[PDB]
Design a protein around this ligand. Structure first.
Ligand SMILES: O=C(O)[C@H]1CCCC[C@H]1C(=O)N1CCc2ccccc2[C@H]1CN1Cc2ccccc2C1=O
Ligand SMILES: O=C(O)[C@H]1CCCC[C@H]1C(=O)N1CCc2ccccc2[C@H]1CN1Cc2ccccc2C1=O
Ligand SMILES: O=C(O)[C@H]1CCCC[C@H]1C(=O)N1CCc2ccccc2[C@H]1CN1Cc2ccccc2C1=O
Lengths: 286, 284, 287
């Protein structure tokens, strides 16, 4: 199993697809994106990698993407899918029951609260209930077959607020708020807990990490990361969180750290081929 | 008993029902002649009037000038004198047993016009127009003056409100709300103009504020649980009731109740089905 | 005063012109241009110095909202930089209360400000004060009775007719009676103890009407309308007569300069600028 990292930003928008194998610490150099992107999000469904949204930041000039592309590792080749109803930069995604859910993000000055769903068998996007709050730089995680949107930016305020999506009822409920305000945080699920790592609070790029216990309904600080970072890639691989790249106010990171929850500590396990931020990250299943 | 006439869900509705705020029960009364959404309701001389609105079938949209009349006894609607113009997204208030029609729209025509109705004669007579063209306007009556609050003018949603003195027959602009609202629930309680919900051109609202006539100041209070515009509003014995509306995607059945003593909301039932743009009134 | 200044503006791109009109003998002096072109800036005079606040640079190769504050010295004919604002502010409003310059609202990209900050020229420092109740860009500002009035504007989605008032001693904002007409980018000033709101845009048409606020009656009253429709107009008072300079009227940029005589209650076109422009910052040498 591999950890994929697509696109991102370094001086201009990137189009790299690379993969990291954690069994031997070795990097792979696969087929590049058709159009460069940053602020996209990645996910895996039935052995295919999907790249959703983001923005093409060239020097002349900018374009928010509504595209859905599909990489087949058997053929090493990208293929266009049906686009989203609207452009979505700094987007969140989750996978529930083999359906991709695109969450918030931005199209220019428009900050979305709307959410839509993709069915890979039919190749069609369909709108579902919008969030209670507009969010770009939102971080998404899927636990107990419920979608979770955490933090972000609503056009005016950076957020510590968090809400939860019940797919069967088709509705969003606001849950307990984070201790710290975060936008562009890495959000994922591990051992029945939601983890919020890094992000931006309007002042500083953060290194603090907090986790949500759904049953105690309370956020809890855990061991912080070595490097401060926002717009970071993140994924879980065998009871271990992996964070990739991001922005720290001055430089772009190539550092990759790995969290072991048994010992509650972070450790620098590799570094990317070049520093970058706003990557789409995802990992092959089971 | 609290009536709910008309509404919208997939298309305009002809439902008339009534909720019992003591034991919580929904009576199934006579449907409307014509299905109407965006209508308003009021009660004069123990009769239920459905003023203006819009029929929205799957093959035609017709803005209504019609005024209907429901008789509690017979369970039966009676066509009355129609208004000079159609008014969808209207507001009403009753001073001196006369029904005031405020604002509304007819296609692309947004009205600053207002017309009074006299049930003793079955006659609509126009009066001083408002300073602002207002659709999705909310109307409240207090100290026997009429207040037009919020609305949409064709380009801008409004936080301004204005006051009609029926003695000199003129409008004067008052202190504007802290928030811009169109299609909000407006009403009077303990000598205060309350305003709940609405759309500001961006999001549906769940905030609530109220106007104090002596201080002339809009103050926020505790916000509703659910975001909603095109809701039905009414006061029943020292507390406000809100019914249905549109949150930006689905149509609410939730019915929240505001206690001004505790300054808190609570869901005290749900409608027989989800719907927005209801005409709502309670029997005096 | 003595001279009426017009700074910056827009015609095809952001301009950097500084010019001054003498009202006694009707002459235009071509003074030194701004370091940076800007439109939507504001102008005020404090202690014989002309300050140009905020605005946006609209070049034909990128746009930049300005947090800048530059001061012009008429004696030296030179523009001197000062301490910049906490945030950039396009389409800004300013008043001067007791030697300090208030910067009110405006925009920076997608962000519409309800925040307000004050400048101390003795110290060269900006300090945030209580923010407004509403987010306002293209807001008009008028100093009366050592209170700061914030009139009309645009909140990002809707054009506004609301007005609100700032009490510097309590450091708090109260909402007052709204204008009869919605105005965004109006010209706002004070004359004979009344706030005048002239011109503006209401989402549909540029305006030519003029209303005014009597502080004791708490009411807005129309007066004689201007000859030309205009928004983003500079405005100032000089010897009991209001002066309006330039603006946008839906298709062209005005060079005309009308003058309201409060007694006759009539406007009259008293000159033209060297070229038409909108979004100018305007001030007058103090009395
Ligand atoms: O608007 C984008 O999509 C582009 C705009 C150009 C800069 C890189 C993109 C960006 O804004 N990113 C990446 C994607 C993303 C995703 C989630 C949250 C935050 C971000 C921000 C994070 N930041 C901030 C920043 C400031 C200055 C220089 C670099 C960066 C940077 O990399
Ligand atoms: O009025 C109308 O022309 C109709 C148009 C068809 C849908 C129902 C009517 C409507 O839109 N109404 C209901 C009455 C009313 C009263 C006050 C203020 C606003 C409204 C709007 C509120 N909205 C907006 C909306 C969009 C999409 C789907 C449903 C709705 C909805 O219900
Ligand atoms: O975003 C801006 O700052 C620039 C954008 C380019 C046009 C000039 C600037 C502008 O829009 N301004 C000037 C400053 C200002 C101040 C207050 C209120 C309104 C304005 C508007 C007035 N408008 C409107 C307009 C439309 C089309 C062409 C010209 C204009 C114009 O000049």
């Amino acid at each position: 199993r591999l950890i994929y990292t697509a696109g991102g930003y370094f001086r201009q928008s990137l189009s790299y697809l690379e993969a990291y194998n954690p069994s031997d610490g070795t990097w792979l150099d696969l087929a590049d994106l058709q159009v460069p992107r940053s602020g996209l999000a990645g996910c895996v469904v039935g052995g295919l990698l999907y790249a959703v949204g983001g923005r093409n930041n060239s020097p002349d000039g900018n374009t928010d993407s509504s595209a859905l592309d599909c990489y087949n590792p058997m053929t090493n080749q990208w293929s266009p899918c049906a686009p989203m109803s609207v452009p979505r930069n700094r987007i969140g995604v989750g996978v529930i029951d083999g359906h991709i859910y695109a969450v918030g993000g931005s199209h220019g000055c428009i900050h979305h609260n709307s959410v839509e769903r993709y069915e890979p068998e039919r190749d069609e996007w369909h709108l579902v209930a919008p969030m209670l709050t507009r969010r770009i730089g939102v971080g998404v995680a899927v636990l107990n077959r419920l979608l979770y949107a955490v933090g972000g930016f609503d056009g005016t305020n950076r957020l510590n607020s968090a809400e939860c999506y019940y797919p069967e009822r088709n509705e969003w409920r606001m849950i307990t708020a984070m201790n710290t305000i975060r936008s562009g945080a890495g959000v994922c699920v591990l051992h029945n807990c939601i983890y919020a790592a890094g992000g931006y609070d309007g002042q500083d790029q953060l290194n603090s990490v907090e986790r949500y216990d759904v049953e105690t309904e309370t956020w809890t600080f855990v061991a912080p990361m070595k490097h401060r970072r926002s717009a970071l890639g993140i994924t879980v691989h065998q009871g271990r969180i992996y964070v990739l790249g991001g922005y720290d106010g001055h430089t772009f990171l190539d550092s990759v750290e790995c969290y072991d929850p048994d010992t509650d500590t972070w450790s620098e396990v590799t570094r990317m081929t070049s520093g970058r931020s706003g990557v789409g990250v995802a990992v092959t299943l089971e």
